[PDB]
Write an enzyme that holds these catalytic residues in place. Structure first.
Site, mmCIF file in Angstrom:
data_model
loop_
_atom_site.group_PDB
_atom_site.id
_atom_site.type_symbol
_atom_site.label_atom_id
_atom_site.label_comp_id
_atom_site.label_asym_id
_atom_site.label_seq_id
_atom_site.Cartn_x
_atom_site.Cartn_y
_atom_site.Cartn_z
ATOM 1 N N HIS A 179 0.810 -1.208 0.000
ATOM 2 C CA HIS A 179 0.000 0.000 0.000
ATOM 3 C C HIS A 179 0.856 1.277 0.000
ATOM 4 C CE1 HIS A 179 -0.222 -0.284 4.533
ATOM 5 N NE2 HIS A 179 0.077 1.009 4.399
ATOM 6 N N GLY A 186 2.089 6.072 9.867
ATOM 7 C CA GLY A 186 3.521 6.027 9.633
ATOM 8 C C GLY A 186 4.153 4.741 10.140
ATOM 9 N N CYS A 202 3.252 1.675 9.546
ATOM 10 C CA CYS A 202 3.132 0.555 8.619
ATOM 11 C C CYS A 202 4.508 0.086 8.201
ATOM 12 C CB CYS A 202 2.287 0.924 7.403
ATOM 13 S SG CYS A 202 0.577 1.352 7.791
HETATM 14 O O1 LIG Z 1 -5.018 1.999 8.717
HETATM 15 C C1 LIG Z 1 -3.958 2.396 8.243
HETATM 16 C C2 LIG Z 1 -3.825 2.758 6.777
HETATM 17 C C3 LIG Z 1 -4.498 1.742 5.883
HETATM 18 C C4 LIG Z 1 -5.846 1.851 5.566
HETATM 19 C C5 LIG Z 1 -6.494 0.849 4.860
HETATM 20 C C6 LIG Z 1 -5.797 -0.274 4.444
HETATM 21 C C7 LIG Z 1 -4.447 -0.355 4.721
HETATM 22 CL CL1 LIG Z 1 -3.533 -1.709 4.119
HETATM 23 C C8 LIG Z 1 -3.792 0.629 5.436
HETATM 24 N N1 LIG Z 1 -2.807 2.453 8.943
HETATM 25 C C9 LIG Z 1 -2.475 2.657 10.302
HETATM 26 C C10 LIG Z 1 -1.713 1.659 10.892
HETATM 27 N N2 LIG Z 1 -1.654 1.461 12.211
HETATM 28 C C11 LIG Z 1 -2.323 2.311 12.993
HETATM 29 C C12 LIG Z 1 -3.074 3.368 12.520
HETATM 30 C C13 LIG Z 1 -3.170 3.550 11.141
HETATM 31 C C14 LIG Z 1 -3.956 4.718 10.656
HETATM 32 C C15 LIG Z 1 -3.428 5.596 9.710
HETATM 33 C C16 LIG Z 1 -4.082 6.779 9.400
HETATM 34 C C17 LIG Z 1 -5.276 7.097 10.018
HETATM 35 C C18 LIG Z 1 -5.824 6.228 10.943
HETATM 36 C C19 LIG Z 1 -5.175 5.044 11.257
#
Ligand SMILES: O=C(Cc1cccc(Cl)c1)Nc1cnccc1-c1ccccc1
Ligand SMILES: O=C(Cc1cccc(Cl)c1)Nc1cnccc1-c1ccccc1
Lengths: 304, 304
Positions: free
Chosen positions: B41, B143, B145
């Site tokens: 992603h 951030g 990820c």
């Molecule tokens: O959820 C996502 C982005 C996402 C969305 C859809 C699919 C994928 Cl593969 C990735 N990443 C995050 C990772 N860990 C904790 C919090 C977040 C996060 C980031 C931004 C706003 C809220 C939460």
């Protein structure tokens, strides 16, 4: 989102762990520059731990009696000295992995990470706090002495704790990196009193702010209180009195959430007077006090 | 003595964290040998995250569009490929800090350490478990990820998890290092169902053995039970059914304490049916299930 008891990355500290052997005793040492720091009880046998005269025992020891090993390489000892309850072993080689470091004596209520070690080898890292009674509730077995507690600021490691002793009560006591014990503890095999352990009120409140940020809001109520009225409740439940400094320190959290410190104090008051009623806050059924307001802000903002 | 949620030392993994930037998206990558692994992603903008055609999006990308940075040095990208939900970026330089490693897909109920990162820089380490519903309850912000979960065996790092997503429920989903998601989760900004999260019964029992070893014995009773009778209680409280394999795995703990597995099951049964009555076990007011029998044995024996 999410909230966990998080420790600092331990790599910078792993590169400092050595094994120190004196006589039949093996423990951990911290190698920074050309000095290895370790608990002075490394010179003791089980017999003299009851009432050791450390200065007299150290007189029977020479540089060659201190075996320092980093991984598999033996370090050559060219000097030895006792500074309070730690020995400083001057070696001929500066640790090539010495990070930027400071020796600081932390305040009770402050938190730090512990890299638990055995034979100079790290086995685990966990986060803990210096209790108001100057003990730490860690996980340490025989051989873990000399394991260090620290904090990290960008690239600088502030060493704050060196493990020395486990009390008969199962709690842990140790020193700063100048060898001064936290609390009234002495490095003797004698019955030592930990003292009453109170709850770090400013940390519980900071954890209640972390809970609100991470969605747990059930404990929020329609009430408020004053410092003096909250502190009446706090004394009844063995909680540290909350001062205006504590309120000031919770300012960034109060601003981030929009919940005034004294309104959060009323939620805490009701939680102390009524309990959780079978519910949880951040996956815990008890009020957590080992997260400072700095730890909450850091965890909720991703400081590397 | 003492018992804490302990993580593995993270140094070996810190030396593998890089920053990967594609377009406007910055996330973490894992550099092992001449390959950087990261969530696919990274090629997505906020618009196409609703329904991405990753193969089509990757077609608009070339090796020079992937910016890989280790500390402050830019890595040159000479190849790129997609393996399930991860991208593999071939770089011209092998990571000089690559430890001995394995890529393993862990079983639900098993535990691992997470090194939470932001911009290729580590910020914290914590211990967690793969929940029976294939989610993890971690601490991750935007951030984070590409942060990895791992285990260590003497000198070998077994990478088991790569962080990808946070569900609207606040829990976390990710993949193994081959890019296969744990659970039914897909890397799309869509409403995804975590599923019912049950309690890992073999882990709670292992933690009850850790409690007995570390002195907490109040919950021990004059009773016993059978697998079928304990499992009747377990189903009522959303606990995993206990199998003979689980009993076998608890053998070293049962031998160490002298408390038969089925007698410990009766203590757990009474704890489920009556609660803690305001008491604690290892400083917790709820039954802890994120310590495997291996973690208890390891923590109680000091494996480095
Ligand atoms: O959820 C996502 C982005 C996402 C969305 C859809 C699919 C994928 Cl593969 C990735 N990443 C995050 C990772 N860990 C904790 C919090 C977040 C996060 C980031 C931004 C706003 C809220 C939460
Ligand atoms: O308590 C001591 C030795 C000691 C004794 C008196 C004074 C000093 Cl300075 C040091 N060290 C340990 C450290 N952390 C956890 C457990 C132990 C431990 C070791 C052996 C058996 C039982 C417990």
């Amino acid at each position: 989102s999410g909230f966990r008891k998080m420790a600092f990355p331990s790599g910078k500290v792993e590169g400092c762990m050595v094994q120190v052997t004196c006589g039949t005793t093996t423990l951990n040492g911290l190698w920074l520059d050309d000095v290895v720091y370790c608990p002075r009880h490394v010179i003791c046998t089980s017999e003299d731990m009851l009432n050791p005269n450390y200065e007299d025992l150290l007189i029977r020891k020479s540089n060659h009696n201190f075996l320092v090993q980093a991984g598999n390489v033996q370090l050559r000892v060219i000097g030895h000295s006792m500074q309070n309850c730690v020995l400083k072993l001057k070696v001929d080689t500066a640790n090539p992995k010495t990070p930027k470091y400071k020796f600081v004596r932390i305040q009770p209520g402050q938190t730090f990470s512990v890299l638990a070690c055995y034979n100079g080898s790290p086995s685990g890292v966990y986060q803990c706090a210096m209790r108001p009674n100057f003990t730490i509730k860690g996980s340490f077995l025989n051989g873990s002495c000399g394991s260090v507690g620290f904090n990290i600021d960008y690239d600088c490691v502030s060493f704050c704790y060196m493990h020395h002793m486990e009390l008969p009560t199962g709690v842990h006591a140790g020193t700063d990196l100048e060898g001064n014990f936290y609390g009234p503890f002495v490095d003797r095999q004698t019955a030592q009193a930990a003292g009453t352990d109170t709850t770090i009120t400013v940390n519980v409140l900071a954890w209640l702010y972390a809970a609100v940020i991470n969605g747990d809001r059930w404990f929020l109520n329609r009430f408020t209180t004053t410092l003096n009225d909250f502190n009446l409740v706090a004394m009844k439940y063995n909680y540290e009195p909350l001062t205006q400094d504590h309120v000031d320190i919770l300012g960034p959290l109060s601003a981030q959430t929009g919940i005034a410190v004294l309104d959060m104090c009323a939620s805490l008051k009701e939680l102390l007077q009524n309990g959780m009623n079978g519910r949880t806050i951040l996956g815990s059924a008890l009020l957590e006090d080992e997260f400072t307001p700095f730890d909450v802000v850091r965890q909720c903002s991703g400081v590397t």
